[PDB]
Coordinates of C-alpha atoms and ligand atoms in Angstrom, one line a residue:
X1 CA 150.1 57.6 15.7
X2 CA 146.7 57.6 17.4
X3 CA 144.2 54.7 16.6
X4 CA 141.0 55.2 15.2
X5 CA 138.4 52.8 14.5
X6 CA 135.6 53.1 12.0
X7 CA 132.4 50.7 12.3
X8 CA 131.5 49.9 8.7
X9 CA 128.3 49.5 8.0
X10 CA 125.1 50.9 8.9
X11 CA 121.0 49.1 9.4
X12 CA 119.8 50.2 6.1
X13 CA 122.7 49.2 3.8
X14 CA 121.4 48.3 0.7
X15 CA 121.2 43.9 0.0
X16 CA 122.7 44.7 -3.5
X17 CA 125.4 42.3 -2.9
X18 CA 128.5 45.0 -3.3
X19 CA 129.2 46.1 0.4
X20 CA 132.8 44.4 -0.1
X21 CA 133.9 46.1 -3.1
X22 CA 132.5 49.6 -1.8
X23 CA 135.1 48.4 1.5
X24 CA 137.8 47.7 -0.9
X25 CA 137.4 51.1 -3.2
X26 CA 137.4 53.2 -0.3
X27 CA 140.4 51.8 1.7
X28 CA 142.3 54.7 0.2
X29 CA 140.7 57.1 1.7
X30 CA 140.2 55.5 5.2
X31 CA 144.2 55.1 5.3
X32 CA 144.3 59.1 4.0
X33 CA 141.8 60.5 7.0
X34 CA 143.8 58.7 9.6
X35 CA 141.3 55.2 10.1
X36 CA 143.7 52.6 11.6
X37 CA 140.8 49.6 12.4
X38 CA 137.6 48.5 10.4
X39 CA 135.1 46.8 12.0
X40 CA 133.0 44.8 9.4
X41 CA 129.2 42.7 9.5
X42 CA 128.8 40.0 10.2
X43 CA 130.5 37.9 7.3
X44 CA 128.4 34.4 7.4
X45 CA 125.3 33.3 5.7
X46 CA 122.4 34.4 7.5
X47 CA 118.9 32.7 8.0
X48 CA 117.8 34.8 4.1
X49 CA 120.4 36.3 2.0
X50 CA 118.6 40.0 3.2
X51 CA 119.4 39.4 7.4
X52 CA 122.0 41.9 8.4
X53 CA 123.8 38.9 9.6
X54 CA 122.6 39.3 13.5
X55 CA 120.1 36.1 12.6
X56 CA 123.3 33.7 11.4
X57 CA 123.0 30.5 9.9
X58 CA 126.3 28.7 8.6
X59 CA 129.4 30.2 10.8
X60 CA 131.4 28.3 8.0
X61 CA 129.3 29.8 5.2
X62 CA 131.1 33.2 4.3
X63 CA 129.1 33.6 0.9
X64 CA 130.7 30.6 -1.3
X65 CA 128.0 28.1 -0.6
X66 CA 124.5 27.9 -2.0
X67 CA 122.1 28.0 1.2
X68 CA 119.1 29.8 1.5
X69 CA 118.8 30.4 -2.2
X70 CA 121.6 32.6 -2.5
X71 CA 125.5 32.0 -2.4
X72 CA 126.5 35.9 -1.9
X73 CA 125.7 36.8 2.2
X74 CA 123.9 40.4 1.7
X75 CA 127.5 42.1 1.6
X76 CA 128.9 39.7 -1.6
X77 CA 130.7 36.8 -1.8
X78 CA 133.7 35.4 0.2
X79 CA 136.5 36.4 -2.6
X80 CA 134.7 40.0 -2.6
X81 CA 135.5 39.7 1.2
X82 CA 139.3 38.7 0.9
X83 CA 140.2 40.8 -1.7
X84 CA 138.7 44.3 0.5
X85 CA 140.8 42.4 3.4
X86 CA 144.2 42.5 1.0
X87 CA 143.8 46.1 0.2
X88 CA 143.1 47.2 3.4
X89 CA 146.2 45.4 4.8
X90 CA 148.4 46.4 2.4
X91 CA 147.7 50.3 3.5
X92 CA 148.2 49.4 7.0
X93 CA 144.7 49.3 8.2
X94 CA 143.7 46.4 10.4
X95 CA 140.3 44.6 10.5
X96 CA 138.1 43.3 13.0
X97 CA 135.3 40.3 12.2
X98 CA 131.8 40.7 14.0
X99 CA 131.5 37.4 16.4
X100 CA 127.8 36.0 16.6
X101 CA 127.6 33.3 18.9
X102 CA 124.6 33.7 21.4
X103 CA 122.3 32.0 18.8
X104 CA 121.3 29.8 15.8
X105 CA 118.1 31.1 13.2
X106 CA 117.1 29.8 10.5
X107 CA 116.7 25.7 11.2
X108 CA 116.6 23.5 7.9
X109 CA 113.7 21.8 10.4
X110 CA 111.8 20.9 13.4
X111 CA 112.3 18.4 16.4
X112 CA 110.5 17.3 18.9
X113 CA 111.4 18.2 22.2
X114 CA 109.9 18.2 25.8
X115 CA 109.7 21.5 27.4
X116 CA 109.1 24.2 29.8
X117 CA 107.5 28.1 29.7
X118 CA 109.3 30.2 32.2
X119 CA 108.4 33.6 33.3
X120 CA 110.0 36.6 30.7
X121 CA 110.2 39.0 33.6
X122 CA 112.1 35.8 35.8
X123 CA 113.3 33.4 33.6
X124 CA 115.0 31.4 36.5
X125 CA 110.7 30.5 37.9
X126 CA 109.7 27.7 35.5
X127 CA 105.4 28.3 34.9
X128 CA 104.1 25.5 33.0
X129 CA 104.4 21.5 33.9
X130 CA 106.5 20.1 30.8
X131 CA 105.0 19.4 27.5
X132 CA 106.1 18.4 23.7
X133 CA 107.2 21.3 21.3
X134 CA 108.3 21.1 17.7
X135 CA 111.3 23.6 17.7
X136 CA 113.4 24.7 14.8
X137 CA 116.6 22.9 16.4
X138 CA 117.3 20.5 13.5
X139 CA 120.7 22.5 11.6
X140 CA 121.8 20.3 8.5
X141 CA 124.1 23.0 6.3
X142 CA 122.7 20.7 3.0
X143 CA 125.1 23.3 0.5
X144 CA 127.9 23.4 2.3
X145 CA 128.0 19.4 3.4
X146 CA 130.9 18.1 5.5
X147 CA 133.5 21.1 3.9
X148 CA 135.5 22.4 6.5
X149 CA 133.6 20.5 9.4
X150 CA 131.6 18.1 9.6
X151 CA 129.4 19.3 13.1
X152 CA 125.7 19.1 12.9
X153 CA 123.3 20.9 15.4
X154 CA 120.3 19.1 17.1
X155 CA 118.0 20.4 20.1
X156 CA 120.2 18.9 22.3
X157 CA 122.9 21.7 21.4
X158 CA 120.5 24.3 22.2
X159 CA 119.0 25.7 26.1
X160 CA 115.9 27.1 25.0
X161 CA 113.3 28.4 21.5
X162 CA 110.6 31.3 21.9
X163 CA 108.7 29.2 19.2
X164 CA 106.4 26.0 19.1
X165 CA 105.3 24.8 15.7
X166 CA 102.9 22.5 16.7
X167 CA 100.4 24.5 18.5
X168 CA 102.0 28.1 16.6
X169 CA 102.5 29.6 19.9
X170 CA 105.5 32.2 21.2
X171 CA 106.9 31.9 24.3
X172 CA 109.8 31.5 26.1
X173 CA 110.7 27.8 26.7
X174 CA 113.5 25.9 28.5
X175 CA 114.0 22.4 27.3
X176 CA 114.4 19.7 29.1
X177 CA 117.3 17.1 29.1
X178 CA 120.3 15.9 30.5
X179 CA 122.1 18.5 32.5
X180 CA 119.9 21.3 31.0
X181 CA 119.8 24.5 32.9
X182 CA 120.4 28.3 31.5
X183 CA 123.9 29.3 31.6
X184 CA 125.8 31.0 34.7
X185 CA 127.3 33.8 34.6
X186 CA 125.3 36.0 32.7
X187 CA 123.6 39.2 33.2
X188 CA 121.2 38.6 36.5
X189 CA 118.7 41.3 34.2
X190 CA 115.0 39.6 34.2
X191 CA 116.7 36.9 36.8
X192 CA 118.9 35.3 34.1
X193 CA 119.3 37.4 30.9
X194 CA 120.5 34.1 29.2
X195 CA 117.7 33.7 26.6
X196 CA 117.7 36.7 24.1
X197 CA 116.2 35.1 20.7
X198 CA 115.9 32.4 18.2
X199 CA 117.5 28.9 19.1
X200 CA 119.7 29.9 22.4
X201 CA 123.1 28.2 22.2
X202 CA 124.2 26.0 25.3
X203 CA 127.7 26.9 26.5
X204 CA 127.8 24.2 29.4
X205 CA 127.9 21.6 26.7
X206 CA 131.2 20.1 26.0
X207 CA 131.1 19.5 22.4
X208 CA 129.8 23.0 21.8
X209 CA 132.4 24.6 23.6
X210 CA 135.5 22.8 21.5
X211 CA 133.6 23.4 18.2
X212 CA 133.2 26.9 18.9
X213 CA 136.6 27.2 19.9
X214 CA 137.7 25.4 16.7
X215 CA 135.3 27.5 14.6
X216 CA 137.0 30.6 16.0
X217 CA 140.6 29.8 14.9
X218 CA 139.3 29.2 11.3
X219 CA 137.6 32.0 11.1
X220 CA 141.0 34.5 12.1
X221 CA 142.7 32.0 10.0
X222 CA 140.6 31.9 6.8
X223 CA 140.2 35.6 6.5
X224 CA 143.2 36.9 8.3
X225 CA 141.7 38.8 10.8
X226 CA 143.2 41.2 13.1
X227 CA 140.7 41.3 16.0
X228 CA 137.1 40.6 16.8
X229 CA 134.1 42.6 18.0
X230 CA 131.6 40.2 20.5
X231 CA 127.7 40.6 19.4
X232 CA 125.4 39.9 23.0
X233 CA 128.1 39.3 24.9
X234 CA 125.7 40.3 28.5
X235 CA 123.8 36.8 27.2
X236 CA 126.6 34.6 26.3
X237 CA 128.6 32.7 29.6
X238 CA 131.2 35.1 30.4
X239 CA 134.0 32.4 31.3
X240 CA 133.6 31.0 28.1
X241 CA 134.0 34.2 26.3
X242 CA 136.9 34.8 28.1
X243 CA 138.4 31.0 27.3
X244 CA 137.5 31.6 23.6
X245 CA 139.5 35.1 23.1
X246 CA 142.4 33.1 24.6
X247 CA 142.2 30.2 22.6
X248 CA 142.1 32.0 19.5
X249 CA 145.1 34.2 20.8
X250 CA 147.3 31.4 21.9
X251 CA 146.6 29.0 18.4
X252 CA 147.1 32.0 15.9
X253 CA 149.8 33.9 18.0
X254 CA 148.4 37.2 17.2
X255 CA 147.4 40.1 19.5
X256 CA 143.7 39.6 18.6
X257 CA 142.5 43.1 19.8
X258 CA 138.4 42.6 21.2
X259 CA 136.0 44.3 22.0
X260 CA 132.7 42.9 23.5
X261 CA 129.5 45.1 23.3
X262 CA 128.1 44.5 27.0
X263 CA 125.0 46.6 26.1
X264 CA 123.8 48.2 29.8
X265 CA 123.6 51.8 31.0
X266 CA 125.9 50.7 33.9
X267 CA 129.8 51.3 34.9
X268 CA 129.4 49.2 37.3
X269 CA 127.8 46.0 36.0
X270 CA 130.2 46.8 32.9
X271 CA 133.4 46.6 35.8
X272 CA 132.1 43.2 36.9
X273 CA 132.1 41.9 33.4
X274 CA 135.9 43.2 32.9
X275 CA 136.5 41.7 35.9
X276 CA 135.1 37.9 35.1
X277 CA 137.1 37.8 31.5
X278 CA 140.2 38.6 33.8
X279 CA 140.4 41.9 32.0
X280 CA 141.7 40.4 28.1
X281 CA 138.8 42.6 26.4
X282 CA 137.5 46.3 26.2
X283 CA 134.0 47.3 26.7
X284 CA 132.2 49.8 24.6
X285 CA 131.4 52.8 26.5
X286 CA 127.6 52.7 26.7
X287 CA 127.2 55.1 29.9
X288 CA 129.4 57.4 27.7
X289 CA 127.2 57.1 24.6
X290 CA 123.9 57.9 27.2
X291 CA 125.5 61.1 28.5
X292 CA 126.1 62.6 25.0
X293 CA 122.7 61.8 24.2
X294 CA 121.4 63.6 27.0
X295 CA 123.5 67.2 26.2
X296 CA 122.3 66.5 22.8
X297 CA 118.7 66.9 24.1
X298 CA 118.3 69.5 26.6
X299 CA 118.9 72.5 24.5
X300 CA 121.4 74.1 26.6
X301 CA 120.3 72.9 30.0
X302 CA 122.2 70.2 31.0
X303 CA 125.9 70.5 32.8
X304 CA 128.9 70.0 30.7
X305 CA 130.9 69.9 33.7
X306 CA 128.5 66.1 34.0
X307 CA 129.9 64.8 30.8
X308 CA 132.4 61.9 32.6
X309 CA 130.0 60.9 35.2
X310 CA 129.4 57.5 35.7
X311 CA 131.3 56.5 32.1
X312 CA 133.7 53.2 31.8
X313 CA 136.2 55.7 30.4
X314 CA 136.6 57.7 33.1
X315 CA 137.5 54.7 35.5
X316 CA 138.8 52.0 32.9
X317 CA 140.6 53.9 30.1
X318 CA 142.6 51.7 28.7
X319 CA 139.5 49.2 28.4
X320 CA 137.0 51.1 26.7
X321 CA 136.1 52.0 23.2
X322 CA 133.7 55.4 23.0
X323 CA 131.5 55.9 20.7
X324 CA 128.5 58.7 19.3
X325 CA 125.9 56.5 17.8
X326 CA 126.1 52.9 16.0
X327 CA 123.5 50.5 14.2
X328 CA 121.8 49.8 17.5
X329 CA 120.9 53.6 18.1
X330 CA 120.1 55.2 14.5
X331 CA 116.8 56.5 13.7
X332 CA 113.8 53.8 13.9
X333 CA 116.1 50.8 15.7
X334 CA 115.2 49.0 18.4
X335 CA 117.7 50.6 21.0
X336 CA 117.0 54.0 19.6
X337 CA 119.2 56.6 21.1
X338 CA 120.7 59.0 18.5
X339 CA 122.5 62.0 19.6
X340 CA 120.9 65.0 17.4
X341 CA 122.4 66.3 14.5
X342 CA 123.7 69.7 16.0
X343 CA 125.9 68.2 18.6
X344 CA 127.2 65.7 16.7
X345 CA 130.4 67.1 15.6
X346 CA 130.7 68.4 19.7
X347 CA 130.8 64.4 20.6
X348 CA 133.5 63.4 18.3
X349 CA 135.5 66.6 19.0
X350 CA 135.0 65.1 22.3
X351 CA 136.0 61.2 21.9
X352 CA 138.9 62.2 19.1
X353 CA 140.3 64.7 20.9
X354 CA 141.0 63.7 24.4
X355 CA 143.7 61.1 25.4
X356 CA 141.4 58.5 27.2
X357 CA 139.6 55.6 25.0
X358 CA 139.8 53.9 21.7
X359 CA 137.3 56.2 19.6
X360 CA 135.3 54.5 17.1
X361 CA 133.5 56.5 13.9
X362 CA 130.0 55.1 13.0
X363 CA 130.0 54.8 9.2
X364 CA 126.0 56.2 9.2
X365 CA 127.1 59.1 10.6
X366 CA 130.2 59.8 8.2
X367 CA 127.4 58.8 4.8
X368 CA 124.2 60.0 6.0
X369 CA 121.3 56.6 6.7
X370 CA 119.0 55.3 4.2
X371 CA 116.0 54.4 6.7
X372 CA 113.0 55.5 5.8
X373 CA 112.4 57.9 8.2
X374 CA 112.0 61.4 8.0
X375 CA 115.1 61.9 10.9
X376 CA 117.5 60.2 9.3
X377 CA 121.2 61.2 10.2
X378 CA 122.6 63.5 7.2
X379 CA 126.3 63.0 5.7
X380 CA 128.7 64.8 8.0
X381 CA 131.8 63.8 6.6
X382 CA 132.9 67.1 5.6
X383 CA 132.4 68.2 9.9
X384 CA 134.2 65.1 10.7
X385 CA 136.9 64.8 8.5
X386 CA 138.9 67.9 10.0
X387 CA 138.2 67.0 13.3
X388 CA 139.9 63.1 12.4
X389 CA 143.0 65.1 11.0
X390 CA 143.2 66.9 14.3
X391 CA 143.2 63.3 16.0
X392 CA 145.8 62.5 13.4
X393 CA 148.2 65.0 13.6
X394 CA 147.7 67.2 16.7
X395 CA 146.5 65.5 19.6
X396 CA 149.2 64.8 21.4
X397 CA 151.0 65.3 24.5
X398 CA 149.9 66.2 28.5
X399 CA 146.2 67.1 28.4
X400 CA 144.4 70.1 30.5
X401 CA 141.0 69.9 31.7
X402 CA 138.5 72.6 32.0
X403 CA 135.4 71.2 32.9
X404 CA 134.6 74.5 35.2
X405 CA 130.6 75.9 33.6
X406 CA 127.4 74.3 32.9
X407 CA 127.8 75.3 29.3
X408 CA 131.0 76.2 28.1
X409 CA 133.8 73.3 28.9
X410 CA 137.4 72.7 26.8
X411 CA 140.6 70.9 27.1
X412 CA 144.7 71.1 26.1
X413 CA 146.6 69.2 24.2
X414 CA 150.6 70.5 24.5
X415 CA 151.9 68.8 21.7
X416 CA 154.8 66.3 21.4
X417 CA 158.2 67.2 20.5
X418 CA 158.3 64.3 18.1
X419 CA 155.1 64.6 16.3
X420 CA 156.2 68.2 14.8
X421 CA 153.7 71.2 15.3
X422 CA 151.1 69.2 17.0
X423 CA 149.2 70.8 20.3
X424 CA 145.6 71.6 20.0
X425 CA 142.9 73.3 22.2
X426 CA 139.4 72.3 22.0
X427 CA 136.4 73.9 23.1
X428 CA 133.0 73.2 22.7
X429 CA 129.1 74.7 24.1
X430 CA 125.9 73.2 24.6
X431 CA 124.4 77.2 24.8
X432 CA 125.5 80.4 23.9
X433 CA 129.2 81.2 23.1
X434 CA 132.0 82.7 24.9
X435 CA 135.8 82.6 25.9
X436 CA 138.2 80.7 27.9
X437 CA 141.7 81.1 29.4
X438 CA 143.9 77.6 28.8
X439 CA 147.3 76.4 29.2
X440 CA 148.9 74.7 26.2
X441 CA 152.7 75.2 27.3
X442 CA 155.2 77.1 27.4
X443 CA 156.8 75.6 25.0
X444 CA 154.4 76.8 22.4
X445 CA 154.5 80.3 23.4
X446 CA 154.0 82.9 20.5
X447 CA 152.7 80.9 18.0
X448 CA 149.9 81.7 15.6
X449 CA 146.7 79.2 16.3
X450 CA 143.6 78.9 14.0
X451 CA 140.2 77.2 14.6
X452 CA 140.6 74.1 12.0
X453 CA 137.0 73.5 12.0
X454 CA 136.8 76.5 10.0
X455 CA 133.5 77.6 12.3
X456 CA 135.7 80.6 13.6
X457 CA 138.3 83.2 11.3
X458 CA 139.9 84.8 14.0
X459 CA 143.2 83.1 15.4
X460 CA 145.1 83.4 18.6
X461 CA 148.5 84.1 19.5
X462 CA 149.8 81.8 22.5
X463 CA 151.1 84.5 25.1
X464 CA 155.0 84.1 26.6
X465 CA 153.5 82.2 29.6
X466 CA 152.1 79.4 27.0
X467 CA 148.4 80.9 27.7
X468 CA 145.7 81.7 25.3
X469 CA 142.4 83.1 25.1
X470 CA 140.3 80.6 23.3
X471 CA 136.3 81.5 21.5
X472 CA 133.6 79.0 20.7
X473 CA 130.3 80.3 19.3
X474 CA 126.7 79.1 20.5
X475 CA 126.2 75.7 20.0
X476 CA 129.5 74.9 18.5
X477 CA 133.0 73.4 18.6
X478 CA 136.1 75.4 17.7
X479 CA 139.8 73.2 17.9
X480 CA 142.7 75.3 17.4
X481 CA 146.1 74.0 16.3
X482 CA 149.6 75.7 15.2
X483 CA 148.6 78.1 11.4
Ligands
LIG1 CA1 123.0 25.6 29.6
LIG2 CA1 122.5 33.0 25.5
LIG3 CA1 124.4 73.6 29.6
LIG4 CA1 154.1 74.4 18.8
LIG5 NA1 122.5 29.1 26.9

């Protein structure tokens, strides 16, 4: 069967402690429409029991200790968790645990620590002469103890803070010590894109490294974890994220699927980072994610026939995961990027569809957001629920491009003589609607198609070549498949 992967979770989900038990009543359903893969939040305590986990505190914390005045994480407590991970598995779904490493938040308290400012815009040109900081360094996990590991974090640990507590200033500062330097390689962005927030982690230093390591095999251990998707991973030392997905791999003996968010509108600085982790990871697809965007918001003016240009799919397939929208590009976050509302159910037609990638669902876009905007995304399960059935059961087989007008562009499924009745033809418009001619075999010829979108009534008969005269109306995606 095809995979699927559904992201689940979205910014604004509620801190009412129940975002496990939701997962666990709604596995069900996720087996039923076809999902094969969850991705989940970030499972660890965070720096307050309201952080969406992106600001962790206690790796070894996953909501069974009482830190930060809660014991729960914001999604429920660590039995919640295990019991959603049991009836997932036992439907055949597999899940994936978000992977936080760039940074600490969240200090139990300060240090003192001899420092340096460097530029933001060239963070390899140090600015200042060095000076004492306080920095929020000291990490002393006083609910959990020594359970599970007895490691404790000092400044030492640590390359850099963007806060002094002393003199209440926010900078950017390198500290100073034995061997200290920002790590190599990383993305060259702003000279070295090391530094991203809170207390930065220090991957040359030996202990860190072998805790992290061990850290990572109790984590796919405790929780029984199928995979793992990398948060940051353009500021994080790229040999040691390749060294960590293979540790983890070669201790548990598992497949450990991953997939690193490398977040850059570039195929090409996305290849090199394939290339430095010896290609053992996928990529998300963010050129891929730009170029729907940018159809989205044209109103009929941009070229469909531009849609694979420049993407990691279209050079890396088996390596990427596409994607619409995620947490990062709803409505009022900081990478803002959301594709609008009426092209929506083009884009998935568009990732589901199509034999290339590992397409992942957004879970906001499935329920609708609960921002307080007034653009949030609406629920569109009901447009993207027959489109996941046509991933399901009818794409499969040699595919046909038609990628031949600015506004009007399709493809072919044939079908696979082993998946019965399966064979699709998609076609979708960013303007007014129309027609097309496609192949879908021969082996299909006379059969009765219907649009099983529902956004057309008329079907078409295959001819006794294997042709067939396809519609679309404006602005609109019709997939037909075998009545
Ligand atoms: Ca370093
Ligand atoms: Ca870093
Ligand atoms: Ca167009
Ligand atoms: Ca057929
Ligand atoms: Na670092």
């Amino acid at each position: 069967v095809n995979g699927t992967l559904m992201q689940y979770f979205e910014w604004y989900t509620p801190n009412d402690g129940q975002h496990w038990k939701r997962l666990q009543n709604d596995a069900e359903h996720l087996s039923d429409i076809g999902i094969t893969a969850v991705w989940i939040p970030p499972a660890y305590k965070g720096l307050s029991q309201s952080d969406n986990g992106y600001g962790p505190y206690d790796l070894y914390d996953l909501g069974e200790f009482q830190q930060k005045g809660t014991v729960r994480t914001k999604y429920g407590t660590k039995s919640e968790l295990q019991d959603a991970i049991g009836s997932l598995h036992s439907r055949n779904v597999q899940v994936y645990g978000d992977v936080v490493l760039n940074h600490k938040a969240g200090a139990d308290a300060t240090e003192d620590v001899t420092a340096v400012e460097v530029n933001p815009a060239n963070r390899n040109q140090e600015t200042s002469e060095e000076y004492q900081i306080k920095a929020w360094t000291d990490f002393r996990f006083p609910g959990r103890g020594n359970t599970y590991s007895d490691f404790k974090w000092h400044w030492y640990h640590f390359d850099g803070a963007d806060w002094d507590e002393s003199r209440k200033i926010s900078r950017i500062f390198k500290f100073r010590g034995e061997g200290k330097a920002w790590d190599w390689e990383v993305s060259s962005e702003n000279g070295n894109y090391d530094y991203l927030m809170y207390a930065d982690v220090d991957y040359d230093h030996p202990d860190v490294v072998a805790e992290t390591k061990k850290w990572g095999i109790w984590y796919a251990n405790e929780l029984s974890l199928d995979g793992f998707r990398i948060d940051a991973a353009k500021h994080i030392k790229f040999s040691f994220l390749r060294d960590w997905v293979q540790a983890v791999r070669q201790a548990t003996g598992k497949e450990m699927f991953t997939v690193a968010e490398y977040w850059q509108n570039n195929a090409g600085k996305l290849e090199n980072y394939l290339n430095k982790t010896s290609f053992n990871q996928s990529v998300f697809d963010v050129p891929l994610h730009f170029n729907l965007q940018a159809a989205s918001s044209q109103g009929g003016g941009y070229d469909m026939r531009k849609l694979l240009n420049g993407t990691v799919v279209s050079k890396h397939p088996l390596k990427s995961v596409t994607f619409v929208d995620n947490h990062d590009t709803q409505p009022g976050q900081s990478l803002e990027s959301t594709v609008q509302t009426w092209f929506k159910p083009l884009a998935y037609a568009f990732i589901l569809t199509r034999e290339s990638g590992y397409p992942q669902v957004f879970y906001g876009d499935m329920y609708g957001t609960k921002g307080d905007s007034q653009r949030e995304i609406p629920a569109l399960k009901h447009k993207i629920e027959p489109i996941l059935k046509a991933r399901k059961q009818y794409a499969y087989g040699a595919q046909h491009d038609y990628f031949d007008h600015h506004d009007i562009v399709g493809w072919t499924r044939e079908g696979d003589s082993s998946v019965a009745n399966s064979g699709l033809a998609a076609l979708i418009t960013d303007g007014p609607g129309g027609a097309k001619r496609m192949y879908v075999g021969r082996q299909n010829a006379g059969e009765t198609w219907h649009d099983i979108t529902g956004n057309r009534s008329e079907p078409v008969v295959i001819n006794s070549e294997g042709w067939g005269e396809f519609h679309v109306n404006g602005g609109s995606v019709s997939i037909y498949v075998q009545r």
